[PDB]
C-alpha cells in the first residue's frame, strides 16, 4: 500500500535534487579557467627506487614528516622506508598476506593494514622492546578491507567490501559508528583535512560524503559509469576527485554538489587505480592499469605530463604533505619517488 | 664514506632486513599455493578434512612438499575486485558435487562458475584440479534418475561410469584455452585417502610445465 507512494516520493525527490543541481550550474569550470594559463609540460624524474618487496605492492602511505612511508605487499610484509636514504626502517610480518590497504598514523606511532581477512590490524611502532607488535585487531567487517585511515592515535575509519564504512575506537576495539548506505563494495576513503568529514567511493559508481561525528550521509555524488576505485580530497576540503574503471577521473564540488570536470582521453581506455592532488591542488595525479601515471591540469583538464617507469599496473600513489615528491607503488613490486 | 656513525648503523640494519626478506622470499617460493573454489554445498569441507571470517588458509605437507590452500568461500564480495590477488597460485582446485545434476540447476550453476573461473583473464596459465565429489550418491541417484534432468541432449547408459565420464567431458569442454592450461580430473568419495596423492601428482606436473616454459623450452 504505502510502498507505492514511497517509491513515488523517492523518484520525485531524485528529480527535485537534479532540478536543484541544474539551477546551480550557471557556468562550467572549463569556461571560468579557460584564460587563466597552462601548466606547460610537467616532467618528473625517478629519484629513488625502493626495492625489497617480492610480490605485487597493493598500498602505500606517506607519514606526515614527508620522509617515512609504509608499503604493503602480498609477500606478507609491511616495509617502513626512509625515502631520503632508501633504508628500510622496519619490516613487519603480517599474519595474513592478502593485504589490500595500509595507513600511517599522523603521529608516526602506529601503522594499520588489512585486506581479505576482514580485519584491521594496528601495529605499534614505538615499543620499549624494540620490535613492532600488533596492538589491536579490529574485527567486525564481513567483507575485505579496502581502505583505512587514522583520525587520531585512537580513531580509524575503514571501508569494506561489505558495502559499509566504520569508525573505530582503537583502545576498546569497538565500532563507534557504522556508515551504511552504499549498495556496492566500498573501495576507497579520503579524510577531510579537518577530519570532520570523509568521502567514500563504492562499486556502485557513486561517492558519498559522511559526517564522522553524526554517522549520517550528507551528500551523494553520481556520474561515473563504472566502479570508483580511488578517491581524494582537494587540499582545501571543498572538493574531491574520483577515479573509476570507466577510464575517467571526475572532480566534484561539495558546496555546489555537482561534478565540475572530467579528465579523459580517447587513447586512455583502462581503469584508474589511484588519485591524488599536488599541494596546491593544481595538478591531479592518477595511476592506471596501463602501467603509467598521468598528470592532469586539474583546472583545465589537460594532460600535463606522464610518469612512466613501471612495468606492471600502478596500484597506489602518494604526494607528500610538503609537496616535494610523489611515490608510485606498482604490481611489479617496486616503489618509485618522483620529483 | 661521508656517512655518520648512526647513518652507517642504520644502513647495516637495513641490510640485515634485506637478508631476512630474501630468506623469506626463498622460503615462500618453494611452497605450493592452491585456490580452493566450489559451488554451494559442494564437497569442499570433506576435501579440506582430507588435506588436513574472511579467507581461510590451510597448511599441510605431503612427500617433502609444502602446501597452502585458500578457501575463499564466505568472502561475500564481488569477485572481480579481489580475484586478481590469486593471479600466481600454482593451481585452482574446483570442487563439484556429482549428486547435484537433479537438484537454475545446481549443475548448471556449477558449470557457469567453472566456466567463469577457467576463462578468467587472471587465470590464463593456471591449471585446474577438478574434484568430482559425492560419486556414491551419484551412483545411487543415477539408477533412480537419468542424467537427462540436466543434460536433455544426453543419450547413454544410466550407469555410473557412462554418466560420470559424460559429465567430466561436459566440464572439460568449458575450457577455451586447451593449449594453455590443463584440467586435472579426479572422482572422489568421503572415504578416498588418495586425494592428496592426486593433488600432489597434478601439482608436480604443473611445476614441471611451468619450469619447461620458464627454462625457455616452452
Amino acid at each position, epitope marked *: 500500500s504505502e510502498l507505492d507512494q514511497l517509491r513515488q516520493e523517492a523518484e520525485q525527490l531524485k528529480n527535485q535534487i537534479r532540478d536543484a543541481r541544474k539551477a546551480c550550474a550557471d557556468a562550467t569550470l572549463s569556461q571560468i579557467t579557460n584564460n587563466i594559463d597552462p601548466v606547460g609540460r610537467i616532467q618528473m624524474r625517478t629519484r629513488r627506487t625502493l626495492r625489497g618487496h617480492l610480490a605485487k605492492i597493493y598500498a602505500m602511505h606517506w607519514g606526515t614528516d614527508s620522509r617515512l612511508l609504509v608499503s604493503a605487499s602480498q609477500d606478507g610484509k609491511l616495509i617502513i622506508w626512509d625515502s631520503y636514504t632508501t633504508n628500510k626502517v622496519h619490516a613487519i610480518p603480517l599474519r595474513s598476506s592478502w593485504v589490500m590497504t595500509c595507513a600511517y598514523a599522523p603521529s608516526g606511532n602506529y601503522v594499520a593494514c588489512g585486506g581479505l581477512d576482514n580485519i584491521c590490524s594496528i601495529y605499534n611502532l614505538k615499543t620499549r622492546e624494540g620490535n613492532v607488535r600488533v596492538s589491536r585487531e579490529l574485527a567486525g567487517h564481513t567483507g575485505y578491507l579496502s581502505c583505512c585511515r587514522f583520525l587520531d592515535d585512537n580513531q580509524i575509519v575503514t571501508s569494506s567490501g561489505d558495502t559499509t564504512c566504520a569508525l573505530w575506537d582503537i583502545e576498546t576495539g569497538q565500532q563507534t559508528t557504522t556508515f551504511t548506505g552504499h549498495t556496492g563494495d566500498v573501495m576507497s576513503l579520503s579524510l577531510a583535512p579537518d577530519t570532520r568529514l570523509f568521502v567514500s567511493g563504492a562499486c556502485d559508481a557513486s561517492a558519498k560524503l559522511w559526517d564522522v561525528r553524526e554517522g549520517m550521509c550528507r551528500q551523494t555524488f553520481t556520474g561515473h559509469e563504472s566502479d570508483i576505485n580511488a578517491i581524494c580530497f582537494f587540499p582545501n576540503g571543498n572538493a574531491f576527485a574520483t577515479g573509476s574503471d570507466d577510464a575517467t577521473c571526475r572532480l566534484f564540488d561539495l558546496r555546489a554538489d555537482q561534478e565540475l570536470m572530467t579528465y579523459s582521453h580517447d587513447n586512455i581506455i583502462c581503469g584508474i587505480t589511484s588519485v591524488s592532488f599536488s599541494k596546491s591542488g593544481r595538478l591531479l595525479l592518477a595511476g592506471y592499469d596501463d602501467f603509467n601515471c598521468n598528470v592532469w591540469d586539474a583546472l583545465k583538464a589537460d594532460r600535463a605530463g606522464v610518469l612512466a617507469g613501471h612495468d606492471n599496473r600502478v596500484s597506489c600513489l602518494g604526494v607528500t604533505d610538503d609537496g616535494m615528491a610523489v611515490a608510485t607503488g606498482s604490481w611489479d613490486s617496486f616503489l618509485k619517488i618522483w620529483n | 664514506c661521508t656517512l*655518520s656513525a648512526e647513518d652507517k648503523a642504520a644502513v647495516e*640494519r637495513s641490510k640485515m632486513i634485506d637478508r631476512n626478506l630474501r630468506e623469506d622470499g626463498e622460503k615462500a617460493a618453494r611452497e605450493v599455493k592452491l585456490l580452493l573454489l566450489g559451488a554451494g554445498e559442494s564437497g569442499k569441507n570433506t576435501i579440506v578434512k582430507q588435506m588436513k571470517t574472511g579467507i581461510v588458509e590451510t597448511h599441510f605437507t605431503f612427500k617433502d612438499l609444502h602446501f597452502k590452500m585458500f578457501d575463499v568461500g564466505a568472502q561475500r564480495s564481488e569477485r572481480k575486485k579481489w580475484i586478481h590477488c590469486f593471479e600466481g597460485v600454482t593451481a585452482i582446485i574446483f570442487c563439484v558435487a556429482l549428486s547435484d545434476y537433479d537438484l537454475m540447476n545446481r549443475m548448471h550453476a556449477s558449470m557457469k562458475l567453472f566456466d567463469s573461473i577457467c576463462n578468467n583473464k587472471w587465470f590464463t596459465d593456471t591449471s585446474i584440479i577438478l574434484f568430482l565429489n559425492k560419486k556414491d550418491l551419484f551412483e545411487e541417484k543415477i539408477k533412480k534418475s537419468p542424467l537427462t534432468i540436466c543434460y536433455p541432449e544426453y543419450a547413454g547408459s544410466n550407469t555410473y561410469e557412462e554418466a560420470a565420464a559424460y559429465i567430466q567431458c561436459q566440464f572439460e569442454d568449458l575450457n577455451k584455452r586447451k593449449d594453455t592450461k590443463e584440467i586435472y580430473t579426479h572422482f572422489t568419495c568421503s572415504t578416498d585417502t588418495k586425494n592428496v596423492q592426486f593433488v600432489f601428482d597434478a601439482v608436480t606436473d604443473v611445476i614441471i610445465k611451468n619450469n619447461l616454459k620458464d627454462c625457455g623450452l616452452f
Partner: single-chain antibody
Amino acid sequence: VQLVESGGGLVQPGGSRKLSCSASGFAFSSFGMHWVRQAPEKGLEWVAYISSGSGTIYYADTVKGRFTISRDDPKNTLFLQMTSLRSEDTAMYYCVRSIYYYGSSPFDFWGQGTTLTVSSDIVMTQATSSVPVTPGESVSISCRSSKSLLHSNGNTYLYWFLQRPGQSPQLLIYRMSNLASGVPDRFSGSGSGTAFTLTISRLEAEDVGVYYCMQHLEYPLTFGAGTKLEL
C-alpha cells in the same frame, strides 16, 4: 627491560676476566650493545661496541688487543673477555643497549653494572664540574666540543645523560634536542654545533646527580667529565 652484568670481582694484574650481560625483556638481537666503564671517582669512558648482527665491532684505543666483545643472541647474552688486565681497568662496567634507525633513541637503557678491582679524538669539555642548586629553580649545564658535532645530514650528535648518586646512567636527550621517552618536559637541550646547553626548568630533589654529555659523531665515543648538581 632488564640488563644484568656479572663476572666482576677482585683480580690480579695481568690476569683475565669475562664479564657477562644477561638481557631480558626486549629483542636483544635487534640492539647493538656497548660496554661503558666508570673508574671509582672518574666519569664515563666508552669501551667497546658490537653491532646488531655482530658485523661491526669497535674498541677504544686503551683496550684494543686486550679486550674482545662478543654476543650470544640465542642466549641473550653479551660478553667482554678481558686479558692482560691492568690497574687502569679498575671500573664499574656497564652494559648499554643501542638501536640505530631513522628516529631511534640510542643509548637508552643501561645495566646496573659490575665492579672489577685490579690490584684525533673529539674532546668534550664540561668546564664546570659542580653546581649548587635549590629545588624549584632553573639551571643550565654547558658542554663544548673539540670539533663540530653537526653533520652534513643535519643531525647534531650530542647526548645528555644523568647519573643519580647510586644508580646507573639515564638518557635524557639524544641528538642535542630530542627528549627521551619517560623524561619530564623540564629538560630541554639546545646548542650550536660546538657549544651545547642542557636546561632544567624547575629543579626537583630527584634531579641531583652528575650530567654527562656524549658525542656520537665518530668512534671512539667520548664523554664529558661530568657536571655535578648539589642541592
